[PDB]
């Protein structure tokens, strides 16, 4: 297109005036230079330094090598004996990284954004590898197709000048600039130019903070919208680094009646104790024009949805108003409010569910559905059933997974999990969780001590260490096989928790791309988690990443489920004492195992 032709046309003026400005800049900058340099020179004028002397051949070496420099012009050649240097000890290779103690979500990357560099000799015959990597990313690399540069100002000027005579222009701009690469930005700029107005920092429906001066009475939903939309329940955090935010809000049923509801005199301005409001409270089941601030009005609106019957408590929280004034205001305002649903549940049955062997029956059903090909474990996600029960259409049921406490499955669902009951330790084969590999949640197993001693650091359960994270002290040093390694400090028995294997989490295909570059150097840190995710420790993790491979190791890895999340733990295969190195089998394919790891450290004993 002729977009450039116009760009230069304005650039004639823009470059002209700009020229002047930059000149005014130069004169300024050149001034500051003149100052700073001078200052430095002054300091240099305050020093005295020894001169160097020519090399003198010491008698300590009668026979040694010498170097001579040939002169291209008319000068002679000097000869000087060489000087040797003392030796120093090197250490194996390493790359940058940062410490971590949990998993970390990472979004997929679609643009290469950088081109590796090999030794400049390997690719001399195998240059095709670059093109294959390019095809893997489909030719998208940052900087490529730049076709110059754009500051978004000349683009706006052209859009304003490019009057009808929007779509084709946007497509051309996207093609000529990877930075924009979309007509959505073009339309956003068009809208901004047409309107050039913004309601403010608060969303389009402005919601000033309660603790600010700009008080405005608003209903409960808008006041709690941000809180409900931002919180993640699983980790009890805002904007969790390992949970997507796509979930339903807190609009859920709850026990409507959970209060004593005992009438009593709330005080002098008591809502009760007056025949008007005292009977009006039951009915709804001369006022004063107090200075109900908008913030206070919104506070009353929100607080009504917490008790629905307590003027005393609400007025106690809202210091601006009074309990009797609160009742009067409800009679004025709350009288025009909409009715509440007031739903609840009973759940009488307790007897038949006691046997609970039908739960094992349904587990057998789930297993026999796909028992043979059950190798495909799937990521957990809370299923939602608003009206229908947890039938075969249940997302958890189809997922072949039990329903965690976060699911919307009814409180008496048959797909849920009962929990442990063991007495001594939830560690042996008889434990139910230990069989279906899990960690006893501290809300179900009240027997093994998992719930108990949450603040203290001593529990009987040996199947709850990962949650409490009691890893062992580890030391770093060069390994006896290849590069670095990890060494253990204190003795440990067999089948004991050592530590976790943390790192970033990515999709399978995403991990496939990084595997291509990792393969070229024959070094990798990719660990398979489940059928959907792969964990990479290349850029984040902890010491355990350095553990080496062995065909007869003393440690083994276990993939486990904890609170609906997959984790990886390392355990000892035999009694281990001070100072021994740790290994485990990478379980690679034999061909790749030999290609990458062909060190055994030991010959054939027999």
């Amino acid at each position: 297109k002729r977009v450039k032709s116009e760009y230069m046309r304005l650039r004639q003026l823009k470059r002209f005036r700009r020229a002047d400005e930059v000149k005014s800049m130069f004169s300024s900058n050149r001034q500051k230079i003149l100052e700073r340099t001078e200052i430095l020179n002054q300091e240099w004028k305050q020093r005295r330094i020894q001169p160097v002397h020519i090399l003198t051949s010491v008698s300590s070496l009668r026979g040694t090598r010498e170097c001579s420099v040939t002169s291209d012009l008319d000068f002679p050649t000097q000869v000087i004996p060489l000087k040797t240097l003392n030796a120093v000890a090197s250490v194996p290779i390493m790359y940058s990284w940062s410490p971590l103690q949990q998993n970390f979500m990472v979004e997929d990357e679609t643009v290469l954004h950088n081109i590796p560099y090999m030794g400049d000799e390997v690719l001399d015959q195998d240059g095709t590898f670059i093109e294959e990597l390019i095809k893997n990313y489909d030719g998208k690399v940052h900087g490529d197709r730049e076709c110059g540069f754009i500051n978004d100002e000349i683009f706006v000027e052209l859009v304003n000048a490019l009057g009808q005579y929007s779509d084709k222009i946007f497509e051309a701009i996207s093609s000529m600039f990877p930075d924009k690469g979309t007509a959505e930005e073009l339309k956003e700029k068009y809208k901004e130019l047409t309107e050039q107005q913004l309601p403010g920092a608060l969303p389009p429906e402005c919601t000033p903070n309660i603790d600010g001066p700009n008080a405005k009475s608003v209903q409960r939903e808008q006041s709690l919208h941000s809180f409900h939309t931002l919180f993640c329940r699983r980790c009890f955090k805002y904007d969790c680094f390992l949970h997507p935010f796509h979930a339903t809000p807190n609009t859920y049923k709850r026990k409507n009646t959970e209060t004593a509801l005992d009438n009593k005199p709330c005080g002098p301005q008591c809502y009760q104790h007056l025949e008007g409001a005292k009977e009006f409270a039951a009915a709804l089941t001369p006022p004063e024009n107090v200075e109900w601030s908008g913030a206070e009005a919104s506070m009353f609106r929100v607080l009504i949805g917490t008790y629905y019957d307590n003027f005393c408590a609400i007025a106690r929280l809202i210091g601006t108003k009074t309990c009797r004034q609160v009742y009067e205001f409800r009679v004025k305002e709350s009288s025009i409010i909409a009715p509440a649903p007031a739903e609840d549940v009973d759940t009488p049955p307790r007897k038949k569910k006691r046997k609970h062997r039908l739960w094992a029956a349904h587990c057998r059903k789930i297993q026999l559905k796909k028992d043979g090909s059950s190798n495909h474990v799937y990521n957990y996600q809370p299923c939602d059933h608003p009206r229908q029960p947890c039938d075969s259409s249940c997302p958890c049921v189809i997922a072949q997974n039990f329903c965690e406490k976060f699911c919307q499955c009814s409180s008496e669902c048959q797909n849920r999990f009962p929990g442990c009951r063991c007495k001594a330790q939830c560690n042996t084969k008889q434990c139910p969780c230990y069989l279906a590999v899990r960690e006893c949640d501290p809300d179900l197993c009240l027997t093994c001590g998992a719930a108990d001693h949450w603040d203290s650091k001593n529990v009987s359960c040996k199947n709850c260490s990962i949650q409490r994270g009691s890893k062992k002290h580890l030391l770093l040093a060069p390994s006896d096989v290849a590069g670095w390694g990890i060494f253990i400090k204190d003795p440990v028995q067999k089948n004991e928790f050592i530590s976790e294997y943390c790192g970033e989490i990515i999709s399978q295909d995403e991990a496939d791309r990084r595997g291509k570059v990792y393969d070229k150097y024959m070094c990798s840190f990719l660990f398979n988690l489940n059928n959907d995710f792969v964990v990479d420790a290349t850029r984040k993790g902890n010491k355990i990443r350095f553990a080496n491979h062995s065909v007869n190791p003393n440690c083994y890895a276990k993939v486990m489920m904890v609170n609906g999340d997959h984790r990886i733990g390392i355990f000892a295969k035999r009694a281990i004492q001070t100072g021994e190195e740790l290994f485990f089998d990478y379980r690679y394919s034999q061909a790749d195992a030999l290609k990458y790891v062909g060190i055994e450290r030991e010959m054939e004993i027999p």
Partner: peptide, 22 residues
């Protein structure tokens, strides 16, 4: 696409539940 497959470190795991008491 996605024809190739990188070599990952995988640790398999399986488990039943129980046989009802008789």
């Amino acid at each position: 696409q996605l024809a190739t497959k990188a070599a990952r470190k995988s640790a398999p795991a399986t488990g039943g539940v129980k046989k009802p008491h008789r």
